[PDB]
Write an enzyme that holds these catalytic residues in place. Structure first.
Site, PDB file in Angstrom:
ATOM      1  N   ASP B  84       0.865  -1.173   0.000  1.00 49.57           N
ATOM      2  CA  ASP B  84       0.000   0.000   0.000  1.00 49.57           C
ATOM      3  C   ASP B  84       0.908   1.233   0.000  1.00 49.57           C
ATOM      4  O   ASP B  84       1.396   1.655   1.051  1.00 49.57           O
ATOM      5  CB  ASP B  84      -0.884   0.003   1.260  1.00 49.57           C
ATOM      6  CG  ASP B  84      -1.917  -1.125   1.265  1.00 49.57           C
ATOM      7  OD1 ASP B  84      -1.738  -2.108   0.511  1.00 49.57           O
ATOM      8  OD2 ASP B  84      -2.905  -1.040   2.032  1.00 49.57           O
ATOM      9  N   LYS B 146      -6.654   2.804  -2.243  1.00 47.80           N
ATOM     10  CA  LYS B 146      -6.877   2.805  -0.801  1.00 47.80           C
ATOM     11  C   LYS B 146      -7.293   4.238  -0.488  1.00 47.80           C
ATOM     12  O   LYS B 146      -6.563   5.183  -0.795  1.00 47.80           O
ATOM     13  CB  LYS B 146      -5.606   2.440  -0.026  1.00 47.80           C
ATOM     14  CG  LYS B 146      -5.862   2.265   1.476  1.00 47.80           C
ATOM     15  CD  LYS B 146      -4.592   1.986   2.277  1.00 47.80           C
ATOM     16  CE  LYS B 146      -4.900   1.904   3.764  1.00 47.80           C
ATOM     17  NZ  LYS B 146      -3.681   1.846   4.624  1.00 47.80           N
ATOM     18  N   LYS B 188     -10.469  -0.068  -1.612  1.00 46.28           N
ATOM     19  CA  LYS B 188     -10.176  -0.342  -0.214  1.00 46.28           C
ATOM     20  C   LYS B 188     -10.453   0.899   0.629  1.00 46.28           C
ATOM     21  O   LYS B 188      -9.691   1.869   0.589  1.00 46.28           O
ATOM     22  CB  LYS B 188      -8.712  -0.745  -0.032  1.00 46.28           C
ATOM     23  CG  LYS B 188      -8.324  -0.953   1.421  1.00 46.28           C
ATOM     24  CD  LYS B 188      -6.830  -1.210   1.562  1.00 46.28           C
ATOM     25  CE  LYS B 188      -6.462  -1.611   2.981  1.00 46.28           C
ATOM     26  NZ  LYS B 188      -6.994  -0.663   3.989  1.00 46.28           N
TER      27      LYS B 188
END
Ligand SMILES: [Zn+2]
Ligand SMILES: [Zn+2]
Lengths: 226, 226
Positions: B84, B146, B188
């Site tokens: 990430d 994300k 996400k």
């Protein structure tokens, strides 16, 4: 007192124009250095002549693998005058001293000659950790101990028994220890220093006068103290 | 729903013992992945069998120069299952799209095929920035978007007119855009997901069911989820 200042603009949302404007302002003010995130080092480099280019590393968590940390510092040392690198906070709290000293010696050694300031993040430390850490920083041959990142959390900090902002007492505590151990280390306080008054108090607290080589004041509002 | 969860323990002051405890907990819960700062990747690697090893990169600022980001992601891909990485927030706010795409395309591609999630930090973005950023993320070949780092500043977020916590509205907006543009991108949502209902709200809003390859829920309190 303006010459003891490390003018810092480290928010992640800082723009190129803002970073450029900061450097220009750094030069006109005559501060000791201008600190920015590494990404802006190249664009700011041309604007700085008298003022030192300062960059942060593995900031603000200090949670990168030692291998990545030495590599990063090595690259950064190619263009930056000074490097403010965060100590391995997590490992310090874990009391993994063997690993903490291995990391800091290797990381500082990677700066190859550049002025290195290790951020101890005082807000997160307890006395049993801070002096052992200061000893490691001197062992690593760093130039300064920077009190904090400016991004410490108040909640956890309080649990560790500390305020989030810089105080004259903490500054004196660090300076007293260095002086007593005879370490060749300067003291850079950062966090909550936005008024000429507070700044003055910290300088008097450290007790070394206005010596840029031994004392620095980190702030995002330099104009306020000169 | 626990199988869509990305159990994250990212505080810089987290200890080794805490990270180990977390991995064990991640495996027991059966969450999709366990995310930690790269320093703890090696020690957690052995405790993870069913659960994927997730690590953040250039977190949480995303303010390292591109070369360092590439090198970092390259090294991280050697031990982590998922990465990430934070988008170059400063450059996005600067609307320096040419630089933003040169950076993300290079960084994601340095992952060598590992699952890459690009953190957008929604709290700091405006509509004039997020959609072009999403286009770039897709162009870069990332697997997920994300929503946030979990360390976004409340003040700046409010300044940008965004809430810091995750919301179904935001999730749905990201999902709708990827669906309309035909992007092969997962969503996400992370930050402020404290309850089962909130988590369900988000999953329903995304409208892709409980598909782990396309939907994740990042949180530090996975037990609350189920
Ligand atoms: Zn001196
Ligand atoms: Zn699927």
């Amino acid at each position: 007192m303006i010459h003891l200042v490390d003018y810092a603009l480290l928010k992640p949302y800082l723009t190129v124009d803002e970073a450029v404007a900061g450097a220009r302002k750094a030069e006109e003010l005559g501060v000791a250095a201008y600190c920015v995130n590494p990404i802006y080092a190249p664009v700011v480099r041309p604007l700085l002549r008298k003022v030192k280019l300062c960059v942060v590393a593995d900031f603000p968590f200090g949670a990168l693998p030692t291998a990545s940390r030495i590599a990063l510092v090595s690259r950064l040392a190619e263009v930056a005058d000074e490097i403010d690198v965060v100590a391995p906070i997590g490992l310090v709290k874990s009391r993994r001293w063997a690993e903490v000293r291995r990391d800091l010696i290797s990381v500082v050694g990677a700066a190859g000659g550049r002025v290195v300031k290790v951020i101890t993040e005082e807000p997160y430390l307890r006395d049993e950790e801070r002096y052992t850490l200061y000893d490691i920083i001197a062992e690593a041959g760093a130039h300064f101990i920077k009190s904090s990142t400016g991004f410490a959390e108040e909640a956890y900090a309080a649990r560790q028994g500390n305020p989030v902002h810089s105080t004259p007492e903490r500054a004196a505590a660090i300076a007293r220890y260095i002086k007593e151990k005879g370490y060749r280390l300067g003291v850079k306080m950062a966090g909550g220093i936005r008024t000429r008054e507070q700044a003055k108090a910290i300088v008097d607290a450290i007790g070394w006068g206005e010596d840029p080589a031994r004392v620095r004041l980190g702030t995002s509002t330099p104009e306020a103290l000169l």
